[model samples]
Target: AEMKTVVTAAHWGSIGVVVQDGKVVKSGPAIEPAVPNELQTVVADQLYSEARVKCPMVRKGFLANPGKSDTTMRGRDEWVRVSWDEALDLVHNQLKRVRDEHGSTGIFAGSYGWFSCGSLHASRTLLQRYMNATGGFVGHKGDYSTGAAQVIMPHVLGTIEVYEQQTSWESILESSDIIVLWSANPLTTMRIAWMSTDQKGIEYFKKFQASGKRIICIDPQKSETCQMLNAEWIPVNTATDVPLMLGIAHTLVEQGKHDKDFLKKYTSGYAKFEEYLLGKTDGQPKTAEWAAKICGVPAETIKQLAADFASKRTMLMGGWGMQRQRHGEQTHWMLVTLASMLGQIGLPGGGFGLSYHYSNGGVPTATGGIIGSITASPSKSAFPLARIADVLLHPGKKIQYNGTEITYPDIKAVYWAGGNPFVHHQDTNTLVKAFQKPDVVIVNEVNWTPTARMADIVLPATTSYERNDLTMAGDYSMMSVYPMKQVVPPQFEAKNDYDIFVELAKRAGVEEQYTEGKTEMEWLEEFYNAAFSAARANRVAMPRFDKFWAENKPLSFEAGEAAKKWVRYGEFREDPLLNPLGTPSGKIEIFSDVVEKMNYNDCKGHPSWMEPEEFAGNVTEEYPLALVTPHPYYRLHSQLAHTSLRQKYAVNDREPVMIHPEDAAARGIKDGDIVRIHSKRGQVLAGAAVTENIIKGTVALHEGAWYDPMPLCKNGCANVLTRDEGTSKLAQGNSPNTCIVQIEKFIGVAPEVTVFKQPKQVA
Candidate 1:
């Protein structure tokens, strides 16, 4: 009766679910006994959550008048239960109507996020596949995470190196003399991975700390990593990373500590970059003193840090949070140039790693195959992901993205899945305004997230444990291949994304093309066999798919000796001509002529300090404090905010806004007091948590809280106060961190948060 079998799947890290008599009893990491940080707190609550969508629901306004639905009533309106057929009919009709009336561009399929852990049944792919076969829908490019880095790093490093495997931990532990965690926090973020995050990273980091090696964390606040490692903290001003990097480069050049031979041998355009750094072209040397005025770092400290970095065998582990700000592309561009100048690209553990501190990057890699998925067919045009609001507001507006001009299409319908953009996107009020422009909105979801509540038609989706699938653990580690079992029957009438989309595609007359005549089990086996093929090719051991699926035992992969001692950029540094990069010059371009020809005023050929519209020096009088929205400690964005974990961490039953003691005192705010944080865009209410760990002029709010946006509402939604602007024309990434806000004590009693409640359904 399947009393004790494991289901290896999760949004992050391989988790084995134990279900006895069709009830989930326990869950933990697939490879090891200990459960992941998020799964431990969320698994039980999510499986039994009251907010789980029991059936297909339709927004009352949209259901009554499908065409004339006031989408503004999305978050506020009531929902009504309907049969799956009715829900699919409304969605299929609306999609067809939108496409027929305004072409495919009118139908926007902007589903994104980490949905299921399985290679198949991915919500984004399912939504897009249905839309693609029916007639291609408007598309989106880039991601909320690492958008700017992905676009800009290619110019500097010759590839989108952000997501690549990191320098193995063994190399760092053995060879690195110093570790500079630049805006990275392994303590808070490394808990989960894209694939199963190996627990070995945190363990290795603990040993790295115990070894008594020098470590430094450069951030706007003393992050959790700083406290965990007991490292020196350098608090730089918000969105001023460019200036801080320029100061380091200036010091290295002025002191003759820059690596001339390495630059000549393995890089191009360094002379042009040096011309600008030394003020030969701009008539203003980017000196440490000059940068100190902009970045709020003392001139002497900048020089000393620069000297220390140049002297030691250091690894610059850049965090993703830094690139989620204004002029974000420059952050990585300047960091790469800095590393190149240090002449450490080829040295063991003495260069840069974009993802090492993320997802347990130091874990050794294994010879494994990535589970394949169905990709959506081509779309005519794609918009920058972060500018969802802008795309909706100004349909014909032309916005530049990565050297291409993209004009926004007049979208009539929005199909969303795998994400809660209402909670993650910047400027909640602005997004609400933009959302109202569409005639219909469809969403596939498990819980009644804010995004689901706003949908015109909500299709219930089962969790990873409620679906048959196959997957591996860890993005880099690829530690094991295992079968993900259907732990139990779908809760209520919930269905997996595959079934939901296939039915809709059938109604839309593209069933055969969408499903390719594959049942759920058939697709799972097909995906499994692909992985097995790779295993056989690599001369690895694996059982037949039928046997493996029945046994449900995880097959571990051994990391070869080469994977452990791997170094990044070693081949390119050894011989540039032979192992050339994917660039014009086949070398790192400190000053990219390609970028110069693009002629973006905000971004130049070489890295330079471009002041953000809202900075400590500029907006201090009006807003008074810089606001930095780091990822929440408990939840991954807004995923688990609807669970009991919300009760465990939320202070005063509200998200806490960390503030400096001095600022709290001046504003008549105290710990646990309800505080209203207001910016130019809008305001949000949060509980005050006074602490000295934060920089004096800076405040910290962990993003991804469920938004309950009533008129002057008191929900602690950080994006409500964030700016709705792009970083630049080239990157077009979000600038959520480039915000300024004023905090004050809430004058009256706080409103009861009805965010997690199921909307009242009309009988």
Candidate 2:
């Protein structure tokens, strides 16, 4: 067999895969990656793992009787092997039944998350398109990531600050004097992106490390980025960011350091916020001393931070983790208000950045066009993404969201593709209960994930390595186009998501409308030609589709000079009257009247400090520690958890829990010991790592572990213990981080992890 090197892209970055004898023998990062991602080396293991779903399967209960099966048997029953024809027919029949009985709104097709780097094989888009062609289904709004910020930012900053581009790294490196990373961990989280990663963010961080710029990390735990840059660590209590931000603002006002002229010109409702910051409104001033009691940060340090922020050109880079908690909407809103006080909304590297840690936000973008994907008319019924469990458990429940009301629909059938709600959604037990509500559940998966095990029908899908497609190198910066050449044939009876959807569409008698008489290659060609025409209109050079595909290498592009020096809000700052913001006042809202009128008790009009539902300051005897679930270092959510990368981070074949030395001693736990962590919802077993890097009374458990519910979770799935509550009525987003738990050393033999293998199958 000839050895061939192929260039492909993953959520992490572009990689070179060496194929031999129709098997991926070796893989490595891109040629010029500043720091090669170790996660790339697990690609071969992921592709050939025994966990891969080799054939179409039907849950034993569902196979016996389609929609009339015992729903309680889901995730617990065995899987029966079936032919692809039988599986497709079962799916089409069930979908038709649901649509005929309950109308279009009864079907739920809100499958979400990063499926593949290839735009052509986007599972969610294809699923929604097929669903719409048949009949419009209930969908979702917003995402798990940045759910709160994306909604609240539009009211305050006049844009979805979480996804919008930020001040370029070129401008930050040249102009910024101080860099404050508030609860942000770029080194670990930046390893993956919503699209293909260019790894430019890590490269710029490497340069910033050597540039001698002062770096500060304000988080409960010393993050990987902080350790890599040797940043000054400012540990505070978990979920206390709002109070700390309020204290900083109060200090700025007390010292007369706030920019009065900028606030008067480019903002609204500052007087109301000022009155609240003082003792005028509530007769309890939000002072540094008052916040110190709640946040556990010294008052002197808070004052010093406020002084430093106002003195230098500082960039406040906030992480999304802070907003994945109770009252999550206020975290970003408070950060924006603090930045507004500093009056650096438009200066180079002087304002607040909500996405410096996400998708290489600071990387300059290339003047390239986007590739189009399958599309359909929008669904009539939708709810916030994080409220899936709620929507399933409580039909006709009206919830407040972004100043509007969303009534939950009675979902009868759930068609999930690409995403694993078992790992991503909070309160695994509650989600399990909700999973039993739907009459039929379907999933297109490559492995026997918890989501797949809980499905009524499971379709075997091919991995990205076994598909031919194309993708861009960066989400924000389309720096290059990489051809995803098929490395080998699809293993066993696996099929592409596009093929499965096409068959379903055909069964629905809408094949022509769905595919438009185009094959995979034809669709790729059309997408490329559209982008080519766009590039030509933008005066950017691009090769023809034939030459680009034949080259089998990345077609690179250059970032223009204007992109290199781009500022986030420079135009609005230069002329507020001419380039006004999209807000009602055409300025920043210190206190939004729209929000005030909505009258949400949890999320008020302004960025005020409200105590979390589960705060470190109010720990009880049963749940004495605040649990913070951060992103995993080895995988993107639950995407690559079954790969060999788990060996490097897993302890006792379970997720590792970082605990303070004091807390570990109190619980009689030692490093590498198996500990049982439990809350009111559920419990899980995790290996303990007693370290001083984390704050006292707080435990750090990275999420995305496969849930192994052997009565109790044998694998350390943090969502098992996390609360299934919304941030507030305004956002209705996930509040996974606002959780409390108690940990104890395991007394008996620990159960073996059995989730990484194929489930029980019957002929």
Candidate 3:
């Protein structure tokens, strides 16, 4: 066979794959202008991994009796290889049974997460479209990435600031004096994106480093970005960011350095916030000294940080890690409040950014059209993403979420696609228990993930390399559109998600509505032509679909001059009356009356420090260490977890747990030793790396490790020990970071890792 190189895009970045004789020979970065991540190079190996699901599988117990409620047999029972026709028929019959017996609301189709880079083959959206075509199903709202910030930002900033395009890097590099990387590790996170990444963020970070601008990183651990930028690391205790921010605001008010005039003009309810900052609202004032006791940062340093921020054009770049804790909503709300005190919002590089660590946020956006996908009709019943377990475990149980009460639906069938709930969801033990509640669980997967193992039916889906589709690079920037050309045929009996859905739609008697008489290529052309028309209307040059696809090159777009000078909230700041915000107040709400009306004790009307159920300060003898779960450096969640990249980072063939030298010494734990970390929920075995990079009473275990629960979590899946609680009644977001645990040296021989290989399969 003739060797050929094909350009394909993934969440990691654009890649060039060398194919020869029906296999991927090599792969590397495709784009020249962007920095290449080593993670992209592992794509070829991941495509051919032993973990790939070769054929449709049905759990043995499920296959024996389809109507039996033997959900507990999942993950324990052997799997049986079934024909695609049999798999689709079984799935259709189960879905219809649930729909007829318990209404469409009983079918939970809340599949979410980054499936791949192609727009047309979006697995979650495609699943929802199929469900909607047949009958409406229960869905999910918000996401795990920025669940807290996305919900709370609207009440405070009048928009979903977490996902919005940020102030361009051009303005920040030229205008900003100090860059505060508050809990952000862009060096690690910029490797992936919600859409295909252009990788311009890392390129700009190099320029920022060369420019010799001052950078400060406020985090519990010295992150990779902090070391790269040589940032001044202020090690604040986990879940205490709100108190530190409150201390800074108090200092700004006391020192008479806050922009009172700007606060009066561009904000509302500052007096109410000020009252709380002082000892007026509460007996204890939110002073630097009080915060020092909680957050472990010196009072003088907090005061100095406040002074430096108020004196310069500082950009407060925040990450989503802090908000993934208990009382997570207050973290970002307080950051916005502190930025309001600095009163440089809408300036060149002065406001707070919630997305610098995500999706190349500061990259200048190109004037390009968006690609449309298979969108489902809006479902009437939905709940916050973090409440999945609660909904499953307690059917018809009412819970408070963002000023509304939501009753959990009695879900009989769960149709999951794209995402791995076993890896992403917290309290894996609880999730395991909840997984037994559903009558049937169906999943579409390329790999035999833990979620797939737990499913009653598993359909083998094709990876992006085995399918041709279209995608745009950079979620915020939309810099380039690439043709994701197929490099190899689908492995084994794997099929495209669109094809699988088409057959199931046919079974459900909704084939015409679901497919709309369009093939995969037809859908791609229609989406491209729509973009081409929009581009032409905007006077941007775009080639015809035929030429673009034939060339297999990315259609690049340029950012205009206006985009280079764009600033967030510039219009609102210029004239508040003319360009009022989307909030009910038409200005920044320091104290939201809408939130106050909700009357939740966990969340206040304004950003205030509330004690979390678990933190460094409240550690007991049983659980003396705070566990912080950050995003992994080598994987986009669990997408590439089964690849060879795991060998580079995995210690002792398990996830590495970073422990401080002091803590490790006290516990008699050494580097590269197997350690067992136990929390109230569960325990996991990890390899320890004793270092001073982490804070004293805390250990760092990166999330996204495949759950290898051989009696215990042998692969050190962090979610097994995390709490399954929501952030607050206001946002109902995940609180995975607020976890307390204890670590000890493992005494016995560890179990061998088994998740990378296929489970017991019977013909």
Candidate 4:
């Protein structure tokens, strides 16, 4: 009844909500200086979304005709409202049947993504808790964002460099003279985070802008970041980053600018890599002229870039976008080699960073300990999350990942929460087919996303605003810990993910282990206490749990001077023998014998150019344009794709595809024209925008347009034309960017998209 304030860890940012009479009346930024436009739309859409399922639903065919249950009737059959008991009973029976018939291996507790920041209420943790108590279920591994980069980086830098904290912005701003953003658009992507996004990076970027330092963005298109800093844009052709990087290394070597002493001391197998780089090993030198023909960047420009980078205090800030293509592992490996050749990895501002410009990378590390969450009991094996379609297609297929052989389990039932694979996975058409493969699919959701629509049973779940929780700002920032208060009561019949999973656990006869006899507030308090235990040991004054909860004020975790002067590999650089890395040689491996033992032709011992399936050279005859599917600036994947915020950036009531004027003219497509883009996989309709901001031979379409499947995608979903194949067995990642498509202006009225409602699948 009175004014109340609550914090929420949403997909965009940590937000502070003002509630009145169980309603979120207003919202603003929490720890960050300003909330993104996408986050502002969350409040409106959360309270008033037409897609929200009011109650638990069961597929009509499955409910009425159990023996003749048409599991393939997903997305087409009508749903009937049911009680909580009935829904839980049905789900429990299916899970029991799968476990009893095929053992725990057949049951998949599929949960991923940053749902809620709470240690207990997080959807993935809750799912794991329930599944672990009944019986261990099939789990997943590796994220799509850095599938290739995360795996290959350890072989090169000796850690999962993609997730490691970056050097402090204070050091970079004061010491660096040049910044090269390779395949990164921090201005657009940095607004979101795993824990929460902080404002320090943005503020530091503003200072960097005012300092008038040189900035260069090498991408297929003139990204928003390039425009924001008014920097030079090098429009490299898609999937040719490997060659461009090799060319840079060749220039540095031929010009005698490479640091020979650093290579001889701090690295291993450099001579073997050098032999391959020259014409000796393969009888073909990876020269600037060769790269110019492959990547469309001038040979002289490539040479000049290498010279300028070696001459200045340069920071190579790499993004994860380029590694989402075929032979993706090589991109990061080549970047590491290039940076090592420059001999500035450990200097204050002269090094390479895989996450520097991502998720508030430059924020200082907090002294606080990480918030603990419930983890699934260790499983012996897991399918790569990016290869969901592949696993579903070939259950018993043997695949190699990392360094071992893994056989895909025959999955019968899937219990999903928090995330939508339909929006994030590649080749929506293939995903639709794979979704049909599972006999029983249960989903906990807030809205009717494509994944929820295909679910055989859908349980209503609450948003973070409707629940009490606790979370931190940036993972590295350690800025503050805010009590995620409940701003409003659960809307309609929706329940918290934790409550729903606990109820399911009760039906599965493992409620005690799942709940651990802890109430919601008790769990929240435990999470807080565990987080500040280190602070208490260090003699920092702190308030009691009750006092902290009553005030609803955020607790600060200040950063020290060491955080400001932090360098990623400073310890290793000072003395390699003392601070050894987690590799076979305890040093950078330009040529890894460990990788060669895997015997994957796609990913070799050293970083080399293995042509992608759909490159500028191979597929241009049939599909003249290469497609680049970068994350949309307006939305976080598909989080706000259905909100008015997405509409603000849309063109002609449909998803916009930016096509170069030259390519558009060749296809007779004008701005605002309806175009059909097709490839070997599938086809989709998009609203075309003819512009020069993109390269001439390529088109740029943002990923995460909802899959509007009415036979063929009609809502401009970019993944419709993407390949479903993995980059290689070693990485087992997605190849979304290694896609080629042909476009033509649509001559007739556009087909209405009917993905949100039932159409022809079951009817």
Tens digit of per-residue lDDT, candidate 3, span 627-671: 899998888888788898888888888899999999998989889
Clash totals in order: 3, 0, 0, 0
Q: How do the predictions measure up, each by TM-score?
A: 0.96, 0.98, 0.98, 0.96
Give one digit per residue, the lDDT tens place, for model 1 in 1-763.
5457465666456666776666777776666533247554356667778888889998888888997876778777888899988888888888888878898888888777777667787788888888878878888888988889898888877899988888888899999988888878887788777755666777777778889998898888888878988989998887887888899999999898989999998888999888888899879999999999888899999999899999999999999888898888889888999999999997788899898778778688887655565566524468888888888888888977778888888888888989988889998888888888889888899998878877788888888777788777676788777577777778889998889888888888788888788888788778778878888888886777788888887767888889989998888888988999998888898888888889998888878778788867677666999999988767878887877677666767788888999999998998999888899888888888899888788898889898887745466888888887788877889888888989889887788988777778886
Q: Write down the lDDT that model 2 would get.
A: 0.88
**All predictions: root-mean-square deviation over Cα?**
2.0, 1.3, 1.4, 2.2
**Per-residue lDDT for 478 in model 1?**
80
TM-score of 2: 0.98
Error of 3 at 763 (Å): 6.8
Global lDDT scores for all candidate models: 0.82, 0.88, 0.89, 0.81
| Residue pair clashes in candidate 4 | none
Q: Rank the candidates by lDDT, best first.
A: 3, 2, 1, 4
Per-residue CA lDDT of model 4 for 1-763, tens digit only, reads: 5546676666456677776766667777765453244554467576667667678988888787542377678777878888999998888888887788888888777666656556666887788778888888888888888889888988877889888789888888999998899999888887777766665666677678779998899999899888888888999998999999989999999999899988987888899999988979888999999999999899999999999999999999999889999989999999999999999998898889888778788788766654555555426548778878877767998888888878888888888888888777888877888877777888998777788888888999987777887777775686777667777788889988888888888887778877778888887777778766866775665676788778786777778899989988888899999997888898899989999888997999989999988967676677988999998888777776766575677776678899998888888889999888899888888899888899888888898788877756788888888887788878888889998989899898888765544322223
| RMSD, candidate 1, Å | 2.0
Runs with alpha carbons beyond 4 Å of true place in candidate 3: 1-3, 377-380
Candidate 2 per-residue lDDT, tens place, 1-763, comes to 5538887878888888988777788988755688769878876887888999999999988988999999999998988999999999999999999999998889999897678878688888889989989978899998999888888999997888888788999999999988888989999888977777888988887788789998999999998888988989999888999889989999999999999999999999999999999979899999999999899899999999999999999999999999998899999998988999999989997898988999898899888776655565424369998889988889999988877888899999999989999988999999999999999999999888989988999999998888888877776888887777787788878999989999999898999998899888888888778778888888987898888888778877789999999999999999999999999899999899998999999989999888877879888988999999989888888878988888888887789999999999987998999999999999999999888988999999999999999847899999999988888988888898888999999998888999988899875
